[model samples]
Target: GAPEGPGPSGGAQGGSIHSGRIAAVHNVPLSVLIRPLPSVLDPAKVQSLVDTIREDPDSVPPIDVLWIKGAQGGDYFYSFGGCHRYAAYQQLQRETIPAKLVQSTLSDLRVYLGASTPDLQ
Candidate 1:
């Protein structure tokens, strides 16, 4: 389920914040989404979704994204959520997937990944 609001962390404590959009799916990479730590990408689950997409690609939902305004080229983001969905896209050999972008930082990402405590303000 999507987070209702800022978790216990509330928001980032340091680093600059910048907002941007996911112009396209190819703009991001799968590795970036599962980096910094491991999340869960069950093959069976992904395969199941792959089958579904093969039938009707539009059935898939937009992936949740955490955008880092200026990481690699002033436009880089990762998938802190939706590993299964990502795998489905990969299995389907699809080049693009809808996404929901959010401006954040590495610190904010740590919070989202639960690597750091959410310092609720």
Candidate 2:
């Protein structure tokens, strides 16, 4: 179900980067989302994404998902890619972002999470 209203934190003042509906959007709190590495954390690049999303929130793509076995208890949600998009969503004061969940392993996870992801290149 779509969020009944803004998250507990309140609605984003100017709306959020995840505002648009492609297929559908889910409200997953920003608290549980984690960026696995620093390589994609470049401020300038991240801001570019922010600018784009601010122009049109739907421009931000749906984030990919990974499941952690015992993180924060059990079945924790994490995503390796979309760090820049995630940061943009963060800067916009969004409590949750949309995601497309996938089942994967730690070994295979490295491929998507790393700076040298083949698809990105």
Candidate 3:
């Protein structure tokens, strides 16, 4: 389900990233993930989750990432959500975290980014 109240923007906003769907499952390196959003992850939740994964690490899920071709002919893996868990993995010193990769064009990212979207062109 999408966040916020039942409004025109509510359903459209959250569903945009999910709409593109996933292309492949891969353990992408944590360092390569270009978090499209801000770094507003709640430390408390991440700390708790980090403490939990240190022991029995079976209660985690793959994150969502967008794969876009960079201007310099490289790859840019953009992550829109799953902030807390991603941080948890980072705190645990994990190299690569499992992610459901979605092959997306720069235009597709505009749905979530809107006017604030970067100059990916």
lDDT of each: 0.59, 0.64, 0.73
Ranking 1 against 2 by lDDT, winner: 2
lDDT of 3 at 59: 65
Can you write out model 1's per-residue Cα lDDT over 15-114, one digit (the tens) per residue? 5443434343433444344344467677788778888788886676677676664433344556656667777776665555667766666677556666
lDDT at position 95, candidate 3: 72
> Worst lDDT window (10 residues) for model 2?
112-121
Report the CA-based lDDT of candidate 3 relative to the real structure: 0.73
**Which digits, one per residue and each the tens of the lDDT, describe model 3 over residues 9-57?**
5334432333455487788877677875777778788888888778667
- How does model 3 score by TM-score? 0.68
RMSD of each: 11.2, 11.6, 13.4
lDDT of 2 by residue, 16-113 (tens): 35444343346667886755566537888987888888888777678777654342223456666777787788889887888876555555656665
Best by TM-score: 3
Can you give the lDDT of residue 86 in candidate 1? 73
List runs of model 2 lying over 4 Å from the truth: 1-25, 68-73, 104-121
**Top of the candidates by lDDT:** 3
Better model by TM-score, 2 or 3? 3
Candidate 3: count of backbone clashes, pairs at least 3 residues apart or interchain: 0
Q: In model 1, how large is the Cα lDDT of residue 34?
A: 33
